[PDB]
Symmetry: C2
Subunit: 133 residues, 2 copies
């Protein structure tokens, strides 16, 4: 019944779409030596902001096991600093977010997807998370 046929379609279609969207980011991100998840973390920390790792994890839907070695790497890259712990952006981190911001726009402009189609996806995923997170 519908729980089976709809979930199968949901599963496959999220698998293909996610796979392929991440591929396009990763392409742009190589030039910066950043992974996709690393990019997400940087983009999520605001410039005036100091965060603890738990709250940061809540915001980007990552576990501590994932976020912890990732922050160390970003620290090594001099993009974030940890101050006893709080996380924030370095001047280099704040600066690198200028070009990084262009990447989402670039990816979107590269896909065949209209402004109206994007709007619908936004609305529906809001809810898909909304009544869910």
């Amino acid at each position: 019944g519908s729980h089976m046929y709809l979930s199968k379609q949901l599963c496959f279609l999220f698998y293909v779409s996610s796979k392929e969207i991440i591929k396009k980011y990763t392409n742009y991100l190589k030039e910066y030596d950043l992974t996709y998840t690393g990019y997400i973390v940087l983009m999520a920390i605001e410039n005036d902001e100091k965060l603890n790792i738990k709250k940061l994890g809540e915001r980007v839907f990552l576990d501590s096991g994932t976020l912890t070695p990732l922050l160390k790497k970003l620290e090594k890259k001099d993009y974030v600093v940890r101050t006893r712990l709080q996380i924030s952006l370095t001047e280099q981190g704040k600066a690198i977010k200028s070009p990084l911001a262009e990447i989402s726009v670039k990816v979107f402009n590269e896909f065949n997807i209209s402004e109206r189609e994007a709007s619908d996806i936004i609305n529906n995923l809001r809810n898909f998370v909304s009544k869910n997170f």
Copy 2:
């Protein structure tokens, strides 16, 4: 600017959350998510060539071949001189594997109409793009 920001993030979060859920359920089978997709794509009594399977799941041989070797080590697929088919053990879990997807998307509070809208959005995006 906002459009592409919201779409970047909302997609990130959706996939982050589907996978978390498939990982929970898949541990019992020692399967990665991509491996699960691959098994789901091979019908119970089917023998396919690896090129066609690659087509079904949008993977090139660079990713698919090592994955098939692993699935073979796990006694789920048989590879034959290259043709792929399910082992008897792989056929024995096709049913419980399918039921996982229902468990997963179920954990969402999502109606039939809400799921259908998402499906139509994504199917459109996929057909226009890949």
